[model samples]
Target: GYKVKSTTTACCDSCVCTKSIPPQCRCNDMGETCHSACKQCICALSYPPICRCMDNTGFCYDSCSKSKDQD
Candidate 1:
């Protein structure tokens, strides 16, 4: 089951992509590297776009496992 613990606000850099060819967004921070298995992401084309992906430990592992199982 999913756990819901607390509530806080996280400030991350805005994802910016140009209209050239496929498209590309801003890269992650220096020390904040992600897992190799967590490759994919979901991005929106809103005024200030956001990219959704697992950024932490269990969240990333669970997401990876779920993606692998789904496929």
Candidate 2:
């Protein structure tokens, strides 16, 4: 069997891609002021997305461990 060309395309599953941010709940005499600016990360890569800070925040899970091997 001859060797095949590289067609590897690594990507993060739903678990890593999907994210949820808890909204701040504040209520006073004026009313609720829970509407604040929420960070919306524009995913440039299908690889679980990287934000402005890649150092402090790591992957949600092991994206490489579950990656497909060269076939």
Candidate 3:
């Protein structure tokens, strides 16, 4: 069977530094923009990947969800 569901690592499976000029990551690809504090926006591995603002503890956006179990 296809890997539809897997274990949650609780850590960001990946991240992109959006603090850069012309910010990196697929935020714009998904019709979104990165925030000033979303420099280290982290993402979690899932059937549908999840991401959240992760600069200075981190924050959440309309496009991402905050994980209560992780820092």
Candidate 4:
């Protein structure tokens, strides 16, 4: 079964990464960092692998070459 709950937003709009949390999963005054497993700032360790990044529209790839195109 899947469970979902309402939680307070972590990071702020002005955040350097513009994410609700940090990518390193290290807590900060801005908010709780993301999991180390995360490839970027927005993605999470949850199922279906989310692509986390400063640009919400961006995607996470296994190779930096693939990501370079996004830049």
Give the top-scoring candidate (TM-score).
3
- lDDT tens digits, residues 8-44, model 1? 2222232345556555444232222323433544556
* lDDT comparing candidate 4 with the true structure: 0.33
Q: Kindly indicate the candidate among 2 and 4 with the higher TM-score.
A: 4
- Report the CA-based lDDT of candidate 1 relative to the real structure: 0.36
Report model 1's TM-score to 2 decimal places: 0.23
* Tens digits of per-residue lDDT for model 4, 1-71: 99765243223222232344434222221223442333356545556555334433222222222232311
lDDT-better candidate, 2 vs 3: 3
In model 2, pairs of residues that clash are: none
Model 4 misplacement above 4 A: 1-41, 55-71
lDDT of 3 by residue, 5-25 (tens): 423322332444457555544
46 Cα displacement, candidate 1 (Å):
0.5
Runs with alpha carbons beyond 4 Å of true place in candidate 1: 1-38, 54-71
Give the root-mean-square deviation of each candidate in angstroms.
Answer: 15.1, 17.8, 14.1, 15.8
- Badly placed stretches (over 4 Å) of model 3 are 1-37, 57-71
Better of 2 and 3 by TM-score: 3
TM-score order of candidates, best first? 3, 1, 4, 2
lDDT, residue 38, model 1:
36
What overall lDDT goes with each candidate model? 0.36, 0.26, 0.39, 0.33
